[PDB]
Amino acid sequence: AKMRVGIVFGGKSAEHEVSLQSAKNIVEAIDKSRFDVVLLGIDKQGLWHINDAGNYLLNAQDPARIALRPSTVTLAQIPGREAQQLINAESGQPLAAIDVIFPIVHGTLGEDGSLQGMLRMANLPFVGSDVLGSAACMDKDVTKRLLRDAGLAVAPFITLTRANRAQFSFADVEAKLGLPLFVKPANQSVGVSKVKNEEQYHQAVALAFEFDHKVVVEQGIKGREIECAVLGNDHPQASTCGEIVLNAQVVVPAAIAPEINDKIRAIAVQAYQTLGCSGMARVDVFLTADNEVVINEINTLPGFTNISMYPKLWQASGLDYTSLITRLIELALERHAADRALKTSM
Amino acid sequence: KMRVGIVFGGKSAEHEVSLQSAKNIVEAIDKSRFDVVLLGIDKQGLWHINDAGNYLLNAQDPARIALRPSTVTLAQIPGREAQQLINAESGQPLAAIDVIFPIVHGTLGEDGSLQGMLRMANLPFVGSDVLGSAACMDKDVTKRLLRDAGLAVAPFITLTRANRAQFSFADVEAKLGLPLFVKPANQSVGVSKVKNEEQYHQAVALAFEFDHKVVVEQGIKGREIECAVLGNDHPQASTCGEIVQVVVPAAIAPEINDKIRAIAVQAYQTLGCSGMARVDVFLTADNEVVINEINTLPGFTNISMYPKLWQASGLDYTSLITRLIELALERHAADRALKT
Ligand SMILES: Nc1ncnc2c1ncn2[C@@H]1O[C@H](COP(=O)(O)O)[C@@H](O)[C@H]1O
Ligand SMILES: Nc1ncnc2c1ncn2[C@@H]1O[C@H](COP(=O)(O)O)[C@@H](O)[C@H]1O
Ligand SMILES: [Cl-]
Ligand SMILES: [Cl-]
Ligand SMILES: [Cl-]
Ligand SMILES: [Cl-]
Numbered sequence: 001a002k003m004r005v006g007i008v009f010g011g012k013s014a015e016h017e018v019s020l021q022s023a024k025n026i027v028e029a030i031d032k033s034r035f036d037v038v039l040l041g042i043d044k045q046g047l048w049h050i051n052d053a054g055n056y057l058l059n060a061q062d063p064a065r066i067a068l069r070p071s072t073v074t075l076a077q078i079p080g081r082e083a084q085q086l087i088n089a090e091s092g093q094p095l096a097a098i099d100v101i102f103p104i105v106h107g108t109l110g111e112d113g114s115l116q117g118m119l120r121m122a123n124l125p126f127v128g129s130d131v132l133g134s135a136a137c138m139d140k141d142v143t144k145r146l147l148r149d150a151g152l153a154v155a156p157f158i159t160l161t162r163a164n165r166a167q168f169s170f171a172d173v174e175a176k177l178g179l180p181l182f183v184k185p186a187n188q189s190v191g192v193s194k195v196k197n198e199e200q201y202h203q204a205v206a207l208a209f210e211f212d213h214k215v216v217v218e219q220g221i222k223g224r225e226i227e228c229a230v231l232g233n234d235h236p237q238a239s240t241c242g243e244i245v246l247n248a249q250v251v252v253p254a255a256i257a258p259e260i261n262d263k264i265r266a267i268a269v270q271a272y273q274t275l276g277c278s279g280m281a282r283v284d285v286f287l288t289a290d291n292e293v294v295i296n297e298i299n300t301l302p303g304f305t306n307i308s309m310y311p312k313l314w315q316a317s318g319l320d321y322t323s324l325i326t327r328l329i330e331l332a333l334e335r336h337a338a339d340r341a342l343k344t345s346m
Numbered sequence: 347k348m349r350v351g352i353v354f355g356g357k358s359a360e361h362e363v364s365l366q367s368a369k370n371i372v373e374a375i376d377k378s379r380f381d382v383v384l385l386g387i388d389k390q391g392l393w394h395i396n397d398a399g400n401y402l403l404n405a406q407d408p409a410r411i412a413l414r415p416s417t418v419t420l421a422q423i424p425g426r427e428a429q430q431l432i433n434a435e436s437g438q439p440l441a442a443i444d445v446i447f448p449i450v451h452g453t454l455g456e457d458g459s460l461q462g463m464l465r466m467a468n469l470p471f472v473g474s475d476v477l478g479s480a481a482c483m484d485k486d487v488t489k490r491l492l493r494d495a496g497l498a499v500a501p502f503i504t505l506t507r508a509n510r511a512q513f514s515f516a517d518v519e520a521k522l523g524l525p526l527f528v529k530p531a532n533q534s535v536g537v538s539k540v541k542n543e544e545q546y547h548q549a550v551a552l553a554f555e556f557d558h559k560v561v562v563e564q565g566i567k568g569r570e571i572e573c574a575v576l577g578n579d580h581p582q583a584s585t586c587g588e589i590v591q592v593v594v595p596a597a598i599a600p601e602i603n604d605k606i607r608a609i610a611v612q613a614y615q616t617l618g619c620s621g622m623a624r625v626d627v628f629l630t631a632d633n634e635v636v637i638n639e640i641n642t643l644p645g646f647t648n649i650s651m652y653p654k655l656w657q658a659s660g661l662d663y664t665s666l667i668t669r670l671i672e673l674a675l676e677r678h679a680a681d682r683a684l685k686t
């Protein structure tokens with residue numbers, strides 16, 4: 001009766017240990033009357049490690065030493081299979097069946113649609129946003145353009161590409177955006193610099209081009225840093241808002257008036273729909289002194305530790321952590337059923 | 347010589363077209379520079395390693411061309427950067443492939459899923475990356491990004507499962523007028539021309555069979571023109587072609603040819619395409635250019651518009667294939683040089 005949930009975690013990013021913590025907390029809290037779990041760890045070189053819930057961590061209690069436990073099984077996926085899709089690569093024998101994947105692998109590949117694309121090739125249902133929603137939210141330039149087109153507020157900006165970058169001087173950028181500026185790679189908070197003068201500008205742009213082929217240069221926004229948790233597929237719902245306050249403290253709920261809370265929540269939901277998210281996302285905004293709401297980022301893989309903003313916000317809104325995990329799995333399976341019902345030709 | 351893995355076939359109704367594309371690429375590819383490895387995907391979605399000497403049944407018959415069945419099924423070990431693909435039956439790795447030329451028409455092969463799998467294998471590949479592929483596949487996302495860029499698209503609304511019943515026919519006619527064209531956002535199957543309410547409800551139901559989003563757009567009056575774009579950061583446009591019959595080059599003024607070409611390049615840049623794309627537009631009587639579609643996996647057969655447009659612009663098919671492979675390798679080399 002139980003579904004087997006494969007939790008895919010870790011990854012090559014600097015957020016590898018956060019992902020381990022997320023996986024640990026999910027394993028600890030998931031409803032065991034409804035779900036069995038299997039742990040699919042990605043080490044820091046990209047390789048996958050399948051383990052049971054009792055032998056996937058090393059030094060699981062101390063955070064400064066927590067680490068993926070190696071697997072003795074190399075796993076492979078057979079693209080195009082509809083069942084028995086995962087096999088022991090060396091023996092060819094199928095692994096125990098996985099009904100749904102819960103991916104919590106931060107950064108490139110894990111959060112940019114590549115992992116979702118591979119899971120789709122293997123016909124594996126999965127939690128969270130699909131290929132397009134993941135890829136688009138990962139690219140801050142594309143996200144900002146879609147949000148702007150929807151009439152939602154974003155920080156005024158210039159996106160530098162390899163093709164266009166030589167057309168701009170610092171004088172052009174300052175003329176359009178003022179000072180200070182924020183410079184960030186479109187796809188990555190690595191490479192983000194605050195810029196007050198020409199020398200810092202050149203160093204920041206050069207730096208960001210070491211991490212991505214596109215660089216977003218933004219007007220600096222004066223505002224509080226508010227975050228909102230969104231949950232759902234076709235009928236998404238927003239949590240209460242939280243705030244990030246320098247000690248940096250996660251403040252739940254944010255100390256804002258209810259009308260402003262609801263205004264941000266409605267904008268979060270609109271943003272979520274504009275970007276085609278599914279399952280979950282965390283929307284990060286700036287709240288200016290005039291209560292203008294400026295959207296900074298839509299994160300399709302929020303942190304999932306017991307202390308992370310996304311679960312804390314749902315807890316503050318009446319949805320406990322165990323129930324949140326169950327809902328995310330139900331949403332994944334609902335979306336998979338809806339997709340598989342679509343027709344392919346006449 | 348570089349080892350070029352051609353991934354072809356697949357589950358779509360364009361399976362046979364993909365087979366013909368792969369056959370035409372095998373026959374034309376510069377053998378002084380490339381060794382071909384055939385990775386055929388059968389009609390059920392399983393991947394195989396095929397022998398160039400016998401991979402096609404009825405190869406000279408377009409109505410019966412078929413992929414010869416094979417004992418090997420391929421598997422991928424995610425996250426590996428070498429020996430990424432194995433013979434699933436034997437556990438043994440395939441020899442390293444330097445670059446993938448994917449020509450799998452249909453959903454997974456064009457919507458970014460296949461590209462995501464190849465990225466997870468760190469394989470260079472021809473054509474657009476995950477986001478460009480996924481965004482160009484979704485006509486709603488494409489049209490919104492083009493509109494945001496200041497380029498012209500047909501005025502439209504996008505129906506979803508959630509909002510589907512919020513829009514009455516009267517609301518739609520008031521906003522967009524008649525006739526309308528109704529299409530699934532992601533698929534030209536499911537496309538209907540609508541001249542009244544009875545046709546509208548039938549067309550919307552049809553499009554919702556194929557996708558969760560349905561584009562309803564204003565009918566455009568104009569000639570149907572196509573333009574082939576090639577390149578990464580410095581893309582170039584072929585001469586234009588017209589669909590009436592296929593007329594290559596299109597019988598339009600050179601100034602208008604160049605206007606459409608420059609818009610096709612802008613559209614390509616707006617959507618973040620790489621390698622190649624075919625841009626389909628409407629040319630109105632006032633010479634306004636309304637962009638209909640950006641196709642990131644054009645046809646590669648000998649009757650296909652995309653190679654024919656380049657052929658009529660002085661780029662031969664063999665050199666086109668070589669350039670596409672060079673572009674894939676250039677993009678991989680750029681990505682590989684990034685800090686991580
Ligand atoms: N346009 C901006 N205006 C003001 N602060 C910004 C802006 N972009 C980034 N920041 C700051 O830089 C941090 C990291 O950038 P990000 O990863 O985009 O959140 C944020 O938490 C802000 O403190
Ligand atoms: N908005 C439109 N205005 C006029 N004709 C259209 C429009 N959308 C689609 N069509 C017609 O329908 C065909 C198939 O649509 P598509 O697959 O979008 O090209 C086109 O080749 C046109 O003949
Ligand atoms: Cl929902
Ligand atoms: Cl979070
Ligand atoms: Cl180029
Ligand atoms: Cl074509």
Ligand SMILES: [Mg+2]
Binds near residue numbers: 284296297
């Ligand atoms: Mg932030």
Ligand SMILES: [Mg+2]
Binds near residue numbers: 534
């Ligand atoms: Mg068309």
